[PDB]
Amino acid sequence: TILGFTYEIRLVEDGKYGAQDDVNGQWNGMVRELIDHKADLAVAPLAITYVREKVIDFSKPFMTLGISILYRKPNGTNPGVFSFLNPLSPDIWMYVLLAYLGVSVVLFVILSTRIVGGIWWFFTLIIISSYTANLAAFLTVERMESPIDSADDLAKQTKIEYGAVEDGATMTFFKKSKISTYDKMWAFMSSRRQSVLVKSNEEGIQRVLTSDYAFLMESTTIEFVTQRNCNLTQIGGLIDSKGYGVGTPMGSPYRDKITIAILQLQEEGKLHMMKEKWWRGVQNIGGIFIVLAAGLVLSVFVAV
Amino acid sequence: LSTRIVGGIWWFFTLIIISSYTANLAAFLTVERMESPIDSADDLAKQTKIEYGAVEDGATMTFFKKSKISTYDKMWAFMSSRRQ
Amino acid sequence: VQNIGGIFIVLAAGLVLSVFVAV
Amino acid sequence: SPIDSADDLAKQTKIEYGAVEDGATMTFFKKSKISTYDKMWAFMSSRRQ
Numbered sequence: 001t002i003l004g005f006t007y008e009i010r011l012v013e014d015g016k017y018g019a020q021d022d023v024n025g026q027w028n029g030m031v032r033e034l035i036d037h038k039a040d041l042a043v044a045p046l047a048i049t050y051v052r053e054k055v056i057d058f059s060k061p062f063m064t065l066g067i068s069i070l071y072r073k074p075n076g077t078n079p080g081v082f083s084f085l086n087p088l089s090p091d092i093w094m095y096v097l098l099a100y101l102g103v104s105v106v107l108f109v110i111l112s113t114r115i116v117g118g119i120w121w122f123f124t125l126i127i128i129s130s131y132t133a134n135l136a137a138f139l140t141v142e143r144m145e146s147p148i149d150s151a152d153d154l155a156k157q158t159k160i161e162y163g164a165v166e167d168g169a170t171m172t173f174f175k176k177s178k179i180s181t182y183d184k185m186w187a188f189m190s191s192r193r194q195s196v197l198v199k200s201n202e203e204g205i206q207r208v209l210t211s212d213y214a215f216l217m218e219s220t221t222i223e224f225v226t227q228r229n230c231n232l233t234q235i236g237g238l239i240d241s242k243g244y245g246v247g248t249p250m251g252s253p254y255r256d257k258i259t260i261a262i263l264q265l266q267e268e269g270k271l272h273m274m275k276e277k278w279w280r281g282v283q284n285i286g287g288i289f290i291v292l293a294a295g296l297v298l299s300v301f302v303a304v
Numbered sequence: 305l306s307t308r309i310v311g312g313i314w315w316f317f318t319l320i321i322i323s324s325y326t327a328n329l330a331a332f333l334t335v336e337r338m339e340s341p342i343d344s345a346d347d348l349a350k351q352t353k354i355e356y357g358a359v360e361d362g363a364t365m366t367f368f369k370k371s372k373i374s375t376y377d378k379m380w381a382f383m384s385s386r387r388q
Numbered sequence: 389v390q391n392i393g394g395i396f397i398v399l400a401a402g403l404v405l406s407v408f409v410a411v
Numbered sequence: 412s413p414i415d416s417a418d419d420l421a422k423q424t425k426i427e428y429g430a431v432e433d434g435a436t437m438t439f440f441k442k443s444k445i446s447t448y449d450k451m452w453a454f455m456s457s458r459r460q
């Protein structure tokens with residue numbers, strides 16, 4: 001509507017983006033389809049990398065983004081309704097019930113009262129001391145466990161599997177990266193090549209749903225997969241800033257008018273409205289209150 | 305015996321809520337005392353959670369450019385990779 | 389168990405001693 | 412915990428450590444195949460005075 005050109009959409013024959021093979025230097029995907037002038041405009045969301053900018057021409061990026069880490073929501077901890085069997089296991093509960101039965105059967109025949117009260121005192125103090133120590137240890141081992149906040153915590157671990165789509169920046173960005181943690185990421189990608197280098201974004205989503213997987217993927221599509229699926233989460237900030245631009249052949253005379261039109265659309269903020277249109281659209285303690293209420297209503301029922 | 309068991313469950317209730325309070329405070333104090341901040345120059349070059357940079361190009365940046373230590377050189381490469 | 393069973397054993401021995409006191 | 416070997420002081424930083432200025436003790440962390448000895452070299456370079 002802003003330039004008056006008529007256009008026809010044709011699917012590329014291999015269904016993949018612009019990459020190259022190192023065995024011959026031949027590009028394939030978007031770049032090979034664009035150097036031979038088979039198509040002119042590449043509106044498909046390509047990344048503005050370095051070597052793909054060097055080979056073929058890009059417009060100005062109409063929006064920016066980065067790579068980030070997709071993870072399963074760690075919602076495995078929930079007390080729920082009652083469920084106080086898990087803290088202070090019922091072996092201890094039947095032990096103290098047998099102790100209460102023993103003091104109840106001694107209570108019929110009862111200088112004796114002072115020592116019975118004393119042994120009851122330090123028995124209850126030792127029991128409550130052990131329970132407070134165990135609960136404090138349990139809370140400080142639960143609180144010292146944290147989710148993987150960013151890429152450094154994922155670099156510290158190796159048990160949770162991680163990876164990205166095969167080629168297309170990601171690990172080819174990591175081999176063009178001298179950061180030692182990201183060098184360890186690239187060494188992991190080389191060492192664990194044969195399991196997690198899935199090209200499809202569907203199975204890269206699907207491996208997070210089934211397995212304990214982290215998936216390195218585009219920060220824009222985080223919004224789409226979190227609007228669709230509410231069981232997923234984003235961890236980490238933004239690694240490095242990239243963008244989505246328009247792919248043109250080298251020396252295309254239309255490209256200057258295309259980026260002037262992109263800046264004209266961004267002058268009024270035209271992109272944001274259809275971006276939002278297409279892209280948006282203590283209980284562990286609570287049981288003892290019920291226990292005290294049941295005991296109070298039992299005392300009320302036996303009092304009358 | 306009814307007043308005795310009401311007093312017993314009252315002492316038990318305040319006992320268990322102070323027990324949970326002590327466990328919560330002990331966990332909070334243990335996490336706070338085991339938490340340590342960053343002070344060394346290697347404590348920023350080790351992870352990517354903290355980003356950093358110099359004022360501009362010049363004596364700050366050319367010292368890390370000439371870093372043969374491979375400790376300032378690693379953070380130099382990190383800040384060089386995302387100079388924008 | 390372990391510590392708790394030993395505390396139970398000590399409690400039973402003290403109960404036996406209190407019965408011996410009560411005679 | 413008390414100190415047990417060089418890997419425990421490799422991650423440690425509150426206890427400073429060093430060696431002779433010029434000698435053969437330098438060349439263990441000048442050339443090494445373990446990154447912990449590189450961390451001790453970083454410890455020497457940060458505390459060269």
Ligand SMILES: C/C(=C/C=C/[C@@H](C)C(=O)O)[C@H]1CN[C@H](C(=O)O)[C@H]1CC(=O)O
Nearest residue numbers: 016017018019045046047165167168169
């Ligand atoms: C998921 C993906 C895979 C690319 C794979 C390689 C082998 C390719 O065909 O260039 C694409 C999606 N669009 C991205 C882009 O080009 O911006 C690219 C991945 C990426 O570069 O972040």
Ligand SMILES: C/C(=C/C=C/[C@@H](C)C(=O)O)[C@H]1CN[C@H](C(=O)O)[C@H]1CC(=O)O
Nearest residue numbers: 429430431432433434435436437438439
């Ligand atoms: C035992 C020893 C002691 C230190 C000597 C220094 C203080 C000196 O007089 O230069 C020597 C042995 N040869 C080493 C050297 O090559 O200087 C040095 C030990 C070392 O510092 O590695």
